[PDB]
Amino acid sequence: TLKYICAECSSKLSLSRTDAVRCKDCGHRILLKARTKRLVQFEAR
Amino acid sequence: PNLNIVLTCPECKVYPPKIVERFSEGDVVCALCGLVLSDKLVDTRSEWRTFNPLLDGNNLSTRIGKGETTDMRFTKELNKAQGKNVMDKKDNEVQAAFAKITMLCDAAELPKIVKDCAKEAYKLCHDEKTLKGKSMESIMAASILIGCRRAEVARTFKEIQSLIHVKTKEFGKTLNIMKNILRGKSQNLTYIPRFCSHLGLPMQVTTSAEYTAKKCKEIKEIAGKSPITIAVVSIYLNILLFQIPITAAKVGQTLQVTEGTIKSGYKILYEHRDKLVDP
Amino acid sequence: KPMVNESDGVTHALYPQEARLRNLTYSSGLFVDVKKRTYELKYELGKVFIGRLPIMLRSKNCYLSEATESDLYKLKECP
Amino acid sequence: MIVPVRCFSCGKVVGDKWESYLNLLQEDELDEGTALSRLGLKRYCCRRMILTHVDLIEKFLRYNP
Amino acid sequence: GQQYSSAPLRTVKEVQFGLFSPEEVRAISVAKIRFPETMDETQTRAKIGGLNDPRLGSIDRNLKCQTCQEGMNECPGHFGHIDLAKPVFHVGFIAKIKKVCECVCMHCGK
Amino acid sequence: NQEDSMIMNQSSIDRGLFRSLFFRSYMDQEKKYGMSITETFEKPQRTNTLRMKHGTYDKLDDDGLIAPGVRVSGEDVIIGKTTPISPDEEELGQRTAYHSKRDASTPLRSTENGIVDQVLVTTNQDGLKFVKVRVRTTKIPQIGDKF
Amino acid sequence: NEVFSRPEWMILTCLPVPPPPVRPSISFNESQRGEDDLTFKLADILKANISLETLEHNGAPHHAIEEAESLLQFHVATYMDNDIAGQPQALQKSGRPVKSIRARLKGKEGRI
Amino acid sequence: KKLMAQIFFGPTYYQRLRHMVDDKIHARARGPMQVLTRQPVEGRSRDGG
Amino acid sequence: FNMKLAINAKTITSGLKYALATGNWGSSRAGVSQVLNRYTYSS
Amino acid sequence: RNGPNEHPGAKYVIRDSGDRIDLRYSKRAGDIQLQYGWKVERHIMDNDPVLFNRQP
Amino acid sequence: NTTVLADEFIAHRLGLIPLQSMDIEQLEYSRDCFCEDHCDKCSVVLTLQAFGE
């Protein structure tokens, strides 16, 4: 189960596999990849 | 004789080939030992970027026509003649059924996927003395429901039957025997969205109907024997869960079930609503 | 008023934005009346889909030819 | 977008002048030349920057996120 | 480098053009191509007798080109021929064919 | 200066002068032929997959993907795609251990780099899932650039 | 020149077949393995070879007899020059014309 | 020092353009050949010659 | 007499969608449809 | 030894035996013993001559 | 980062925010820090907690 988001409710779906492409609180139909809580070190050079 | 080449290091001979591929400069290099093996690695990608053999298999032919530097005679001879070399192939009855389902899968909007499977299975058998004709239609009816039933979409028989009249019985055998064909050549929920899709409903009644449909089957009430019935009563009782105007009078004339089972389905479900309260 | 036939079978309104990212096509369907009839010869014994038509954006047939500026933000379309 | 931090050429103080700049206009019905002046921007490389910024981000914020 | 070969190296000095005795076309051709079905009908490597058969030049760097051995980078291709039931005009010469006949008696042929 | 060139304040550059963003986006989709051939977004491995790109995958997720915001350089495979291989069909050398699946993943341009911006997932028009990745990189003025 | 240039040979009798390298097999994802316009222009002419074979093996309607020959002599012409004046532009499946051999040499970006 | 002649000087609107160098640079030493004439492939993104 | 076989809808929808997607306009014409040019507003 | 990477380095060492080594992916073998006759693909350095054109 | 700005575009301007620098010499350079790349001898670490509330 992996946290993905929808562009009509902005709710951390956090779903897994074998599921219809949909979101909660709005029948919405697209989802994103929801960036990593893993740090990312910066070369701000 | 197998006329093969096994790629192999001459200065290692250590192992089955443990190398790496240097496409972007065109060589394979002995990953371990460091020596190139081959060179001028041709493009294997930009090759395709320019541009039915699972069905048609191996035969070749072409679609052709008239030119700008031409007259209607050469247009006419290549119109008649490029019909004269189609009898060399039964594939007129191969191609046309495609063209049939090609027309048809379109006509009821079906995606590319349903068609291809519903094409593909049509390659699979395409014939047997067992089939022995069978109308050339009820097979094609079955030739798509299999593809649909395989494209993760599911349709009732009444449905494609109300796309194509097939009397459903010889078809039903034809589909049965078609299934057992691919058995040797080797799920009632799916309808609910499209059902309510015309009903302009929102998903909750559908989802609720799912767990209702989910609960009815497992416990008891083997529920439906033609259980698209219970798929429907699920809709209706799940809109009996709602106040929203969905008269079974509307449901039956729009889902094509006399409301008697709707009452009865809901009836045992007016009894089985009690254990049908998740929210 | 424009829509999509999704593969499952469902159909629904479609917004220009979703068209772009679903690689869809901003079309609306067409419907015409058909008079099927017969004669036997001097004497004679619904509504029909005919295709999907793409629509120029900001045309009356496009959802946006009215929509409010604020809603354009809610429609995620630069005003 | 947002009111660059200090000028390309001079580098004097802008990431403060920005909204001070505004109140002047609305409240004081105040001309620009006068405004930047009592903002303390007597040179003009700066009298470029703020004069010709575009505060776009006040558009993006309209979008629901 | 390409694999060694002992035939002494020279460079072209003359190029004589001309046409084929069809005899020659057969005389060289390693193959009579038959079945427009291109490659192995069982959807494995290649269709023999057919429009690219392994007697000809070979591919995928993994074939070996039956006659002249492996290297795709060395097989220069080897020729197929096909015979024509009915002799056919060669386009490039029609003007000269139409030019020709006027020079000859159609009966004597001289 | 000569012949239409220019001298730029190297400083002003440091104050964002003329700097600009740049947005590449990448596309893919998994499509089937008899469904007996089925493309699949997933993480491929040098343990069981054949013909595998030289760069790294480990920035790939288990779903064949990458979280947005992750830094990437060139030659970092962006989307992990895999294709069915028939054992009997090809026999290209190394097949005797894998017999699993072929790679047709789409790496980042070997020449570009930056930060993943926006990963979305949809079905295409016809029900096949397909993913777009958007790349963001910043572009400071350099010697060549045309003004 | 009787040794190299015979009017006998001005009229095509046996066709050589340039092996794959001239007309290679563009070969993608185990499935997406396309071929060059030449590939077909063999097969069609291979077909137009074998049909008119049988029509003369079996039967002689003696005007359709003419036809596959006008037909065959048509293709082989196209196979050797697609842009011929006062003829059809013999197209490909994709609708676009056939990259005949002469076109491989025509002008800018020909081989030469 | 002073500059023995006086300079023109003002602001002026300037545009930037796509044609950044990092898009226009490449060099090739035995890249990948074509399929057909085994010649070095074309195309800058493709390691062309 | 069935209607849905009678009218092949694709005949139009496929026609336009194509003939937009490329400026091919039949062939017999090209250069009429482009991708839009979203470089900068004025463009 | 400077490898292909720092500028005054080299990419390819050619053995007289028609035989070519990439200097990266052979660092496992490290430093080799070179010999006369062998070829070496250094990077370009100063004062090589190069041919330098502007089309047309 | 939820915000509408691209990250470094923030981080860029976070560069140009002037800082108190009297006692600057009592700080030694980054490179000259044997430290684990920063420490109270070489650098100052600032962080931020901005919320659109």
Ligand SMILES: [Zn+2]
């Ligand atoms: Zn939502």
Ligand SMILES: [Zn+2]
């Ligand atoms: Zn080795």
Ligand SMILES: [Zn+2]
């Ligand atoms: Zn200034």
Ligand SMILES: [Zn+2]
């Ligand atoms: Zn050969």
Ligand SMILES: [Zn+2]
């Ligand atoms: Zn005579």
Ligand SMILES: [Zn+2]
């Ligand atoms: Zn320190």
